[PDB]
Design a protein around this ligand. Sequence first.
Ligand SMILES: [Mg+2]
Ligand SMILES: [Mg+2]
Ligand SMILES: [Mg+2]
Ligand SMILES: [Mg+2]
Ligand SMILES: [Mg+2]
Ligand SMILES: [Mg+2]
Ligand SMILES: [Mg+2]
Ligand SMILES: [Mg+2]
Ligand SMILES: [Mg+2]
Ligand SMILES: [Mg+2]
Ligand SMILES: [Mg+2]
Ligand SMILES: [Mg+2]
Ligand SMILES: [Mg+2]
Ligand SMILES: [Mg+2]
Ligand SMILES: [Mg+2]
Ligand SMILES: [Mg+2]
Ligand SMILES: [Mg+2]
Ligand SMILES: [Mg+2]
Ligand SMILES: [Mg+2]
Ligand SMILES: [Mg+2]
Ligand SMILES: [Mg+2]
Ligand SMILES: [Mg+2]
Ligand SMILES: [Mg+2]
Ligand SMILES: [Mg+2]
Ligand SMILES: [Mg+2]
Ligand SMILES: [Mg+2]
Ligand SMILES: [Mg+2]
Ligand SMILES: [Mg+2]
Ligand SMILES: [Mg+2]
Ligand SMILES: [Mg+2]
Ligand SMILES: [Mg+2]
Ligand SMILES: [Mg+2]
Ligand SMILES: [Mg+2]
Ligand SMILES: [Mg+2]
Ligand SMILES: [Mg+2]
Ligand SMILES: [Mg+2]
Ligand SMILES: [Mg+2]
Lengths: 260, 144, 185, 62, 67
Amino acid sequence: ARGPKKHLKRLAAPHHWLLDKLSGCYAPRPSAGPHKLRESLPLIVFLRNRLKYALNGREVKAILMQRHVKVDGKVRTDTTYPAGFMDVITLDATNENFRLVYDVKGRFAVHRITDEEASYKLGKVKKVQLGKKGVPYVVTHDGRTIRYPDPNIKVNDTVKIDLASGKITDFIKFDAGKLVYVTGGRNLGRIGTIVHKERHDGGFDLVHIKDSLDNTFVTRLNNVFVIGEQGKPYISLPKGKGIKLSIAEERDRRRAQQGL
Amino acid sequence: GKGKPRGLNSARKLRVHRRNNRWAENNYKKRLLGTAFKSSPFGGSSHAKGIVLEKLGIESKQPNSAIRKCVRVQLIKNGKKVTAFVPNDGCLNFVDENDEVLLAGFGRKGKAKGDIPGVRFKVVKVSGVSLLALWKEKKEKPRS
Amino acid sequence: PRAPRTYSKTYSTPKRPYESSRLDAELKLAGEFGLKNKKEIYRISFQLSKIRRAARDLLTRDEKDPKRLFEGNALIRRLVRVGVLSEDKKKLDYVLALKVEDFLERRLQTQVYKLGLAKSVHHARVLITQRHIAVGKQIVNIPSFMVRLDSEKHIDFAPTSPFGGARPGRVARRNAARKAEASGE
Amino acid sequence: AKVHGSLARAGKVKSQTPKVEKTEKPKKPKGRAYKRLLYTRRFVNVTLVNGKRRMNPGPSVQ
Amino acid sequence: SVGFGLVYNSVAEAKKFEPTYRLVRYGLAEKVEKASRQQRKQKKNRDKKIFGTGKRLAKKVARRNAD
RNA sequence: GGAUAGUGGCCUACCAUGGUUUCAACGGGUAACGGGGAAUAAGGGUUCGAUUCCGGAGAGGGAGCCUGAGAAACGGCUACCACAUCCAAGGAAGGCAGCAGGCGCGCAAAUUACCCAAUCCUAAUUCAGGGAGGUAGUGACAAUAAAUAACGAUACAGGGCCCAUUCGGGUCUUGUAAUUGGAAUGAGUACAAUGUAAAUACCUUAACGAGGAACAAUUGGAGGGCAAGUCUGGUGCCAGCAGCCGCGGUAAUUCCAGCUCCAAUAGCGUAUAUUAAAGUUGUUGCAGUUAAAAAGCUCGUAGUUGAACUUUGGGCCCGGUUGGCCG
RNA sequence: GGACUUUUACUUUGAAAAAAUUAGAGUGUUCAAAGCAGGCGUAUUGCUCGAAUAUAUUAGCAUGGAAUAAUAGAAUAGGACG
Ligand SMILES: [Mg+2]
Ligand SMILES: [Mg+2]
Ligand SMILES: [Mg+2]
Ligand SMILES: [Mg+2]
Ligand SMILES: [Mg+2]
Ligand SMILES: [Mg+2]
Ligand SMILES: [Mg+2]
Ligand SMILES: [Mg+2]
Ligand SMILES: [Mg+2]
Ligand SMILES: [Mg+2]
Ligand SMILES: [Mg+2]
Ligand SMILES: [Mg+2]
Ligand SMILES: [Mg+2]
Ligand SMILES: [Mg+2]
Ligand SMILES: [Mg+2]
Ligand SMILES: [Mg+2]
Ligand SMILES: [Mg+2]
Ligand SMILES: [Mg+2]
Ligand SMILES: [Mg+2]
Ligand SMILES: [Mg+2]
Ligand SMILES: [Mg+2]
Ligand SMILES: [Mg+2]
Ligand SMILES: [Mg+2]
Ligand SMILES: [Mg+2]
Ligand SMILES: [Mg+2]
Ligand SMILES: [Mg+2]
Ligand SMILES: [Mg+2]
Ligand SMILES: [Mg+2]
Ligand SMILES: [Mg+2]
Ligand SMILES: [Mg+2]
Ligand SMILES: [Mg+2]
Ligand SMILES: [Mg+2]
Ligand SMILES: [Mg+2]
Ligand SMILES: [Mg+2]
Ligand SMILES: [Mg+2]
Ligand SMILES: [Mg+2]
Ligand SMILES: [Mg+2]
């Protein structure tokens, strides 16, 4: 196409943002950044779509150009910064913090969390590798490289980075029966223990996942994101605890809650 | 039994054999051979307008007897000469020689209608007003 | 390069266009429910067919079928909320027996007639379109409004309009002045 | 087969039919009112019959 | 009549945060009076045929006619 | 080996003779950009997709290259080819398959309008720019909702259930009106507010806005198929009608009209294509003695298709679901 | 306890799967085509459900099955197992 595309037609846009069909021709289109543009969430979406603090688009740069918002600690002013999974986003001028942790449909929950926790976040290691000058380094999913890590951490292990200082502080291995988040695929939004990793030499290992309500299911190796010991999360989980309820069951929970 | 192969592995034969046979189907072959675009006096288009060369009084087929009023038109878009029937009482006096008229099919898909021989078309407009409107005197033919 | 504001045709005309016994049957309905044209019967005719088709489909499925069960009782739930399906005809077999007037009766047309207000469907018509009616605060001026059960007992006259209170119409409020302009001064 | 026939008499009959103008008359009810009119007439009133009923039987059998 | 409205934690703080088409409805900010789009544009394009100040070039233009 | 960002006959030198094909190569045609999808509703299918999203290609035709991370870029350059503008005749300059608009083409397709308010993009950038995009104009493409009238009054007629001895007939309820009277309303026109970037329309709302020369619905049709005239006047195998069968030759149910009637109705007709009907392409699912159709005969390769048998039967454990039942 | 079909077809179940469109749940755009909204209250500085689900009929990948249909194998034993 002769080079980099810069627009985004308002339908090719990631569905989980829940933009509306009309309103205009276009969607925000993520900037280049820490997360893959289809797996991301523009700040502009968050502030005006998810948070409803803004109306215009102008009134978002309004907020952003005020440093009212910081992502993973740092002040980010880009209208369309590719904020994504495990991220924090902190609105100081209204003392609230969030965490971009998935819904159970597959969307980005407005899962508000404390000022504790906000000082850390998880990070699946994508590659761990020996850099130049004999130095080693891990590469988390969010586009962080942390040099000098524990020789114990291999790929698909998660890592508790700080947030103000880099630095890995504790880490979880990937093995039989750990608390797992699903980051994409059909089962996006789910949460549970493992049981089996089906190895397929050549490509695409598969992870059978059990939830607290005993519902086995499968995904691909990269879809899986370890987050703690069984029943013991390493972070706050949104409402519904990533369980996936059938639309039958779903019907009740709503109409039965209604009335009183 | 049946005279057609029934093997689970015979698709090719059953497939080509019908593809082979769609040809005896007229409407299909007309479509595939593009008769429409080639031999048909219109492009395949639903209408054509040409210029009126002369007026004709084609006599009817048996067992009828009348002088069906028509016109030899020469189609602008491809210079073809074909003749077209001019419907309704004395409308033939609405069209003149050299008069530029819109023709349409006779609604037979190419065949001749009724007892009017050689005529596969009809005059629908003339000097761009509508023959229908003229015959009912609600519109008037602009001067030549 | 926007996005299509999608659309749909609401009715469908019959195949054979000159059945006398259908045209008799059709004309009848037009007169007792106060209809303007055949299209108002077609629109409903069409409606029913999608219901019967949706119905007859779920029935081919084995029961206990999470789709059948979900998407069946849902249909039934909607059909009852309007008064097309009876309070204990709640079975898919029974939605299949739904005939055209079942819907036609629930017409806000035929409801301004039924519970007083009109004493004529062809009075009920002009009553509605001339905004002389309301479900609560809301003036509903569409004859094919389809009155649901809970709303049935709320179809009182308009908060404006003479027939409902506050002021008379301009033809009233003009005679009242014309009997003053001449007979007085 | 024969293509030049007489064009001389093109428009005979439309030009020698005596021009008689349509009678003035009350209007029919354009709209729902018409169908209503048609209902109450076609089978509420029910005019002349025979074993079929008849829509346009001008000057009858007698 | 359902509508939408908002209340700012000041007067002139509302003034830097409100779209200037609102402020003019109020009399708050003033109504800016500029030339029509095509008029605006046609100027830009006119101005583009010029390298330098032009304040220089109008000498070139005029030097030729005054001899 | 060269070359490329790199793989590779990508190119070169040398060496072999290999590579594809009836399981249809190669060649031809396409009124062929591919897909998402669209029309057609028993199923199976049939037909379509230039066109809102994705991918591709191209910027009059070809080739070549500068710059750059990215172009073989065309609102970049260079040449040839085809066009073609200005000229003081020496020279100079252009590329709308961007938005408008013009010509041509044809059956066939709208304003040289307003704006960055929204959606989003770009930049050194909260500001600038955006015919991206939005707004309005033209717009019976297609789709949705649905006014063109409503309720009385009375005089006959009566559905009149009767009383009942008779033009003696109760009391509502249909229908007929050159008969009547009070109500209702938005189509409009318009204060205002609302809407808007500014206007406009929508919604809301004062002042007005109904009785038939209106606020006056049309388009087809009335022999059959096929719903609805054997009424009238005109024509006389003429004019004309008729998808098809057929109507017309002086009593025309079919032409030309008046009357009335039918069907659909803010819409109806016509032409062309296409789908259903078509079990008239048949996998489901056709037909082949005589209606179209078994090669004169046999062999035979490709293709399709090909008898039967190999753990059968017995006996345990385990927790599952629809009906007995009754609260 | 983990890999395991002689080699296939077949079939079951999944995974990796854009939106719109389609099927379709919820929602009183006043109805409807739509849209993805909205719903509640002290409505004087708030509360709150959502934006599901099905889809896909080839091929590839993963998996439960072995009836049906192919196919391989010890015969001059250059047989099998330890
Ligand atoms: Mg961006
Ligand atoms: Mg000739
Ligand atoms: Mg300048
Ligand atoms: Mg190379
Ligand atoms: Mg080589
Ligand atoms: Mg050779
Ligand atoms: Mg195509
Ligand atoms: Mg082409
Ligand atoms: Mg296409
Ligand atoms: Mg195609
Ligand atoms: Mg084309
Ligand atoms: Mg290009
Ligand atoms: Mg051109
Ligand atoms: Mg550049
Ligand atoms: Mg370009
Ligand atoms: Mg180029
Ligand atoms: Mg250009
Ligand atoms: Mg143009
Ligand atoms: Mg011009
Ligand atoms: Mg024309
Ligand atoms: Mg057009
Ligand atoms: Mg803008
Ligand atoms: Mg700007
Ligand atoms: Mg400044
Ligand atoms: Mg009118
Ligand atoms: Mg009137
Ligand atoms: Mg008529
Ligand atoms: Mg009939
Ligand atoms: Mg006669
Ligand atoms: Mg006829
Ligand atoms: Mg007649
Ligand atoms: Mg046959
Ligand atoms: Mg024969
Ligand atoms: Mg023979
Ligand atoms: Mg066998
Ligand atoms: Mg993928
Ligand atoms: Mg298998």
